[PDB]
Design a binder for this molecule. Structure first.
Ligand code: KJK
Length: 261
């Protein structure tokens, strides 16, 4: 209850909409705040796309080594890795890492294309038992995050449950699950988000997202020191189209729901 109140307080101060789902695998409990509302996933959707490629690889040896051409026409709005490879190839492993660890958008588009498009990523989510996730478009338009628009959204509850399946459960084979977690633990974009609300000794694998309407997201698998793992989704979005990102709100939310663990 105290946690409920404190999240409400943080929401009020922030001026936006906050969605939180914590799963504590110590005792199979959850902390939920607007966990059944929809939020634009933005780049947090890249976990699902990388996982779909990993799943495909279980029946296609060496798929992760398959090369993909990067052409000027592939560049989009945010290309931190791909812009270094124009007019060469990158492997699907390389693209997965770039999508997950740098939030590269070309890399996401290549993962999307490889598996058959947004509807294929969505069908993979369904196959896992996630009936909430929907990836409707490609990069960069999937990040518009317009209030009231259900495209490219999920709920905090659904994303937490799916991320626990992917990272701690059996959605993926052991090699593929380890590769996903390795990639996420190597993320470079999350240090100001959930990470920033946890003790320094805790280990985190996370994926951030940023979008229109100051949308600021993070989904994480967390290994606290000497404790069973956690799954945490913190989604946040704002009323103004050009609102500035608020990674600090995610850090605050993470502190509130884990303080006292
Ligand atoms: B995606 O949501 O991930 C992402 C992040 C992130 O992980 O936090 C940061 C920067 C870019 C990206 C790529 C994806 N998002 C977008 O393509 C839209 C986003 C909108 C805000 C932009 N920065 C504006 C600063 N005035 C960057 C692109």
């Amino acid at each position: 209850a105290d946690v409920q109140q404190k999240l409400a307080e943080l929401e009020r101060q922030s001026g936006g909409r906050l969605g939180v789902a914590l799963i504590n695998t110590a005792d199979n409990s959850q902390i939920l705040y607007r966990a059944d509302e929809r939020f634009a996933m933005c780049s947090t959707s890249k976990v699902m796309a990388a996982a779909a490629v990993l799943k495909k690889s279980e029946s296609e040896p060496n798929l992760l080594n398959q090369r993909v051409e990067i052409k000027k026409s592939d560049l989009v709005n945010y290309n931190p890795i791909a812009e270094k490879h124009v007019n060469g190839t990158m492997s699907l492993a390389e693209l997965s890492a770039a999508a997950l660890q740098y939030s590269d958008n070309v890399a996401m588009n290549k993962l999307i294309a490889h598996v058959g498009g947004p509807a294929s990523v969505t069908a993979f989510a369904r196959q896992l038992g996630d009936e909430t996730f929907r990836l409707d478009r490609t990069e960069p338009t999937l990040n518009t995050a317009i209030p009231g628009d259900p495209r490219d959204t999920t709920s905090p509850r659904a994303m937490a449950q799916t991320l626990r399946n992917l990272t701690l459960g059996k959605a993926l084979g052991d090699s593929q699950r380890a590769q996903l977690v390795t990639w996420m633990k190597g993320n470079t974009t999350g240090a100001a988000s959930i990470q920033a609300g946890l003790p320094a000794s805790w280990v985190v694998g996370d994926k951030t997202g940023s979008g229109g309407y100051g949308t600021t997201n993070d989904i994480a698998v967390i290994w606290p020191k000497d404790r069973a793992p956690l799954i945490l989704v913190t989604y946040f979005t704002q009323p103004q189209p050009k609102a500035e990102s608020r990674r600090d709100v995610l850090a605050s939310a993470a502190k509130i729901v884990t303080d006292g663990l």
